[PDB]
């Protein structure tokens, strides 16, 4: 496919910078959802997926827990859509 | 493979930031080389390979009509 692929799930990048709600809207309109941090943490995909949006609504990082307490909703970040 | 794909070519990301010469050495160790500007300009691959080193010695970009820099380098 036209992007990354892992275990049968294919993620396409979107270069445009948009907030979380717009990213989710675009992913859903494209018959897809934002990447799940659970499946992307350990796998190599993180190297490409860092500082992109996730389902939980926070940028994806390698930290195990303790998500960013400070609000990140009003921010712009590139997004992947499955 | 572990990385991106185009025309039977696998591109692997080495997230470590390094100069052009260290990037060339690392790719040579892998038996691969840096991407060429021609193959990436006309592809979606560009969105991933932008601001990453190329064989020409300058960062890959669509613009324009240095050994002192370090940037994430792919390997094919």
């Amino acid at each position: 496919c036209n992007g990354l692929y892992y275990q049968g799930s294919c993620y396409i990048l979107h270069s445009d910078y948009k907030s979380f709600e717009d990213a989710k809207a675009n992913c859903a309109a494209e018959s897809s959802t934002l990447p799940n941090k659970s499946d992307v943490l350990t796998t190599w995909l993180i190297d490409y997926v860092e500082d992109t949006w996730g389902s939980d609504g926070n940028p994806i990082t390698k930290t195990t827990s303790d998500y960013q307490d400070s609000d990140v909703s009003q921010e712009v970040r590139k997004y992947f859509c499955t | 493979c572990n990385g991106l794909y185009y025309q039977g070519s696998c591109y692997i990301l080495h997230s470590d930031y390094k100069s052009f010469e260290d990037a060339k050495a690392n790719c040579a160790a892998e038996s691969s080389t840096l991407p060429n500007k021609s193959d990436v300009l006309t592809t979606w691959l560009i969105d991933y390979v932008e601001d990453t080193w190329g064989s020409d010695g300058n960062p890959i970009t669509k613009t324009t009509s240095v050994s002192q820099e370090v940037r994430k380098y792919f390997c094919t």
């Epitope: 990048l13 270069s15 910078y17 490409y48 860092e50 500082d51 992109t52 926070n58 940028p59 990082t61 390698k62 930290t63 195990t64 303790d66 960013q68 400070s70 990140v72 921010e75 712009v76 590139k78 | 470590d16 930031y17 969105d47 991933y48 390979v49 932008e50 601001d51 990453t52 960062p59 970009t61 669509k62 613009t63 820099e69 940037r71 994430k72």
Partner: antibody, heavy 121, light 105 residues
Amino acid sequence: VQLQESGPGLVKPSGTLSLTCAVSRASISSSNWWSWLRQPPGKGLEWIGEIFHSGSTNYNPSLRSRVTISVDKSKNQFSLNVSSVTAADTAVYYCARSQGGSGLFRAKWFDPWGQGTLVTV
Amino acid sequence: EIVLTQSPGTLSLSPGERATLSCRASQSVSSSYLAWYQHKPGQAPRLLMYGASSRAPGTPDRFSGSGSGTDFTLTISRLEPEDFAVYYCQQYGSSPRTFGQGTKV
């Protein structure tokens, strides 16, 4: 990439402080996120936002409301307006550059800084 | 907002020493992503290291950095009169990029 900061040193409280920086030896349209930072006198530094050639701006949540960063490509100048000053904003504002922005591989660290102008409210 | 604290506020020395500067984080920083800087009074701040263990071009080899998660540290093996100044920690693994307090020499 030589960055030089220029702006009004004195901005009375609650006014808008506009600091403009000039990009030299490179293009503002290039793949670089231009950020503005703050150094309160004697205290630690902060990060008061960033901008790109497309106008996309990402701010610090604490300072999101007050600040507005803009870009003018004709004069290759990326400027920052801080409104509703509370007299706690006195600092040596710095221009900054963060490699990347066109691709997915943005390097956050601000390698080329610029001599910062000190503004006294 | 990860708050970074630099333990030694001032490490006063005369030229020649294995100076060690340390700085800790409230929360773990992803990938040990901490790039130190330099600040000579008035002069434009520089990028001494990125990634907490890599030296950007233009800085000598005497700067060696090590750390992970909470704790990060910079080390100057030997000191020269043109290499003593304020130093900073910069973590870029959190949504708001947070600096650290200066460590004057």
